[PDB]
């Protein structure tokens, strides 16, 4: 079905263009205007850079692999592409985790947040969160620790065509945990605390001036966590599942869920960079 | 009182002679035209002459 292949290529190109355009728009809005330079906005810049490098590097190569059904480049470039993919995904998710933690500290400790977070501290934590992401991605892939003992996998690793992912229990479990599961629980806990604080504040307001003339909080939390959980949870669930059981799931569903995780990066600039200052800057640029 | 301090001030402020507005406008125009050659904001400045760039 050449029509199906053409449509898949068209939609892949559309996703590439959308991700690149949104990410470069966000990053140039941060760079050009000194008003947007804020301690919390450095995390947004880091997330934008991670999503941008992911969209520029692995989305086009992945789309080419999907369309051509083979890896045209070298064997080492396949490992480099896989490492870039893992690094980008881990860095992006950990950056969402860092943003959630920063917001939590902003609300739960109103007085100490002013001095606890500084520009130097923001730079240090951004460097650390980028370094930890690289260690889980580049170190195992380059040092061949993620290599499995499966017969067909090891057979095709020498082959130039085989660039499909293959991993054993250890690397799969560790990478999945570190990349997604710890950020997930951290973000859900901090957002539950923030929701509790918002509900307490709303109750105080109602008791204060309710006689005179939580939908917004729930809607915002759904727009924040929903676009991330719905896009990444299935992929990591099936990751652990198929690593646990070889014949549990097929490869097409795994690739589709991985691509859902990829396209998640498009929603992040809209999910987070939606401040009225951001809108004004975008209108000025347009 | 306060009324005297203001009435006397108005009396002493309206006695000054007034030049015609045409002469004042001509003087301002002449000054601007004469000194426009030395204005660095009004006219673009060369890169060598510009100290900020």
């Amino acid at each position: 079905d050449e029509v199906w292949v053409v449509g898949m290529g068209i939609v892949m190109s559309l996703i590439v263009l959308a991700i690149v355009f949104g990410n470069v728009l966000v990053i140039t809005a941060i760079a050009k205007f000194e008003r947007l330079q804020t301690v919390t906005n450095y995390f947004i810049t880091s997330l934008a850079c991670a999503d941008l490098v992911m969209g520029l590097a692995v989305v086009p190569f992945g789309a080419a692999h999907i369309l051509t059904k083979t890896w045209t480049f070298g064997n080492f470039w396949c490992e480099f592409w896989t490492s870039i993919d893992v690094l980008c995904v881990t860095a992006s998710i950990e950056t969402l985790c860092v943003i959630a933690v920063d917001r939590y500290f902003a609300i739960t400790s109103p007085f100490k947040y002013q001095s606890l977070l500084t520009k130097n501290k923001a730079r240090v934590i951004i460097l650390m969160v980028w370094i930890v992401s690289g260690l889980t991605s580049f170190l195992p892939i380059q040092m061949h620790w993620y290599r499995a003992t499966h017969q067909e996998a090891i057979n095709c690793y020498a082959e130039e065509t085989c660039c499909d992912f293959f991993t054993n229990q250890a690397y799969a479990i560790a990478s999945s945990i570190v990349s997604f599961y710890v950020p997930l629980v951290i973000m859900v806990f901090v957002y539950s605390r923030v929701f509790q604080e918002a509900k307490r504040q709303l109750q105080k307001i109602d008791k204060s001036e309710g006689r005179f003339h939580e939908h917004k909080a729930l809607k915002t939390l759904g727009i924040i966590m929903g676009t991330f959980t719905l896009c990444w949870l299935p992929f990591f669930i099936v990751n652990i599942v198929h690593v646990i059981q070889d014949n549990l799931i097929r490869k097409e569903v795994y690739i589709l869920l991985n691509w859902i995780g990829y396209v998640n990066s498009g929603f992040n600039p809209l999910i987070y960079c939606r401040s009225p200052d951001f809108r004004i800057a975008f209108q000025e640029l347009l | 009182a306060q009324a005297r301090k203001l009435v006397e001030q108005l009396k002493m402020e309206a006695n000054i002679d007034r030049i015609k507005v045409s002469k004042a406008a001509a003087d301002l125009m002449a000054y601007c035209e004469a000194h426009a050659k030395e204005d660095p904001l009004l006219t673009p400045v060369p890169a060598s002459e510009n100290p900020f760039r």
Partner: protein, 333 residues
């Protein structure tokens, strides 16, 4: 009592009639045939960062390089515009400030604020040289007549000439109904004018200590004052979105600078060298450059995060820098 009130009204009517008779033809008619200056484009050559809060006032040095800026952080910073680096940093006993000035000798820096005292700092020596007191309100603006005597625009509706060595008011000028919010010195030290929060703007003579002329064209309060470079005219800023120019010899307003797009006040006004471009810092986020003679918005300066509160052109007219409520200065050219 009431009999003297009628005499004042008659005198005011006579003054208004004389001013109306003097106005044979408006400045707009005479300048009609002159060529427009065209569009004036300016760019921020250097942005001076380091301030912790909003800047209210700035004053260029005697030369074209040194600056001084006062902010609510409690620190005065003297910059070097030619290399965009700080030279001195002076703390304050009072956190809130409203004005600053730079001596023509280049050795003294005067700072005021909500604290009624006026502080003078010895740049060439940063200890407080003298703390002038006696005003019963905030100091809107201070200027250096010389290295030995200054003048201040207090909030008690009384501008007073000070003496640094003596530390006491040599002369006090009174008569303004409202608080004085701006002040500027003529090229000669003999005369100066001050704009008050009432509509009227008064001209004061230092030698005699008595006001000579009063201009009441505006309807709102005055916020900015600046003489024409020759010293025979001056323009004012108002919160009613109107900038107006007055002639001392003609004793009447000449032109008004207004536009339907602007409904915000003016916080700072200064004249470019040769008096052709009127630079006014508006209460909105941008700055508008007005033609002095044609009342045409030749250029617009934009790029400030918050309201522009200060504006000044160098003595040699080399460049202009604006001090906004954002913590960053910006030098234009």
């Amino acid at each position: 009592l009431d009999q003297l009130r009628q005499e004042a009204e008659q005198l005011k009517n006579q003054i208004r009639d004389a001013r109306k008779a003097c106005a044979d033809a408006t400045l707009s008619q005479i300048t009609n045939n002159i060529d427009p200056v065209g569009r004036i484009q300016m760019r921020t050559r250097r942005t001076l960062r380091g301030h912790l809060a909003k800047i209210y006032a700035m004053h260029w040095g005697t030369d074209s390089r040194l600056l001084v800026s006062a902010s609510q952080d409690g620190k005065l910073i003297i910059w070097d515009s030619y290399t965009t680096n700080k030279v001195h940093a002076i703390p304050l006993r009072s956190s809130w400030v409203m004005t600053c000035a730079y001596a023509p000798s280049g050795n003294y820096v005067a700072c005021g604020g909500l604290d009624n005292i006026c502080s003078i700092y010895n740049l060439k020596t940063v200890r407080v040289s003298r703390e002038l007191a006696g005003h019963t309100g905030y100091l809107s603006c201070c200027r250096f007549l010389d290295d030995n005597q200054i003048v201040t625009s207090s909030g008690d509706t009384t501008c007073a000439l000070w003496d640094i060595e003596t530390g006491q008011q040599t002369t006090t000028f009174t008569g303004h109904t409202g608080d004085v919010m701006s002040l500027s010195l003529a090229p000669d030290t003999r005369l100066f004018v001050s704009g008050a929060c009432d509509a009227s703007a008064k001209l004061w003579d230092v030698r005699e200590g008595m006001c000579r002329q009063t201009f009441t064209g505006h309807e709102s309060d005055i916020n900015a004052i600046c003489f024409f470079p020759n010293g025979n005219a001056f323009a004012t800023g108002s919160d009613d979105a109107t900038c107006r120019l007055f002639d001392l010899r003609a004793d009447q307003e000449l032109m008004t600078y207004s536009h339907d797009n602007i409904i915000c006040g003016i916080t700072s006004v200064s004249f470019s060298k040769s008096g052709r471009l009127l630079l006014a810092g508006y209460d909105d986020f941008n700055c508008n450059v007005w033609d002095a003679l044609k009342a045409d918005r030749a250029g617009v300066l934009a790029g400030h995060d918050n309201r522009v509160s200060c504006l000044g052109v160098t003595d040699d007219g080399m460049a202009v820098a604006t001090g906004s409520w954002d913590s960053f200065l910006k030098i234009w050219n």
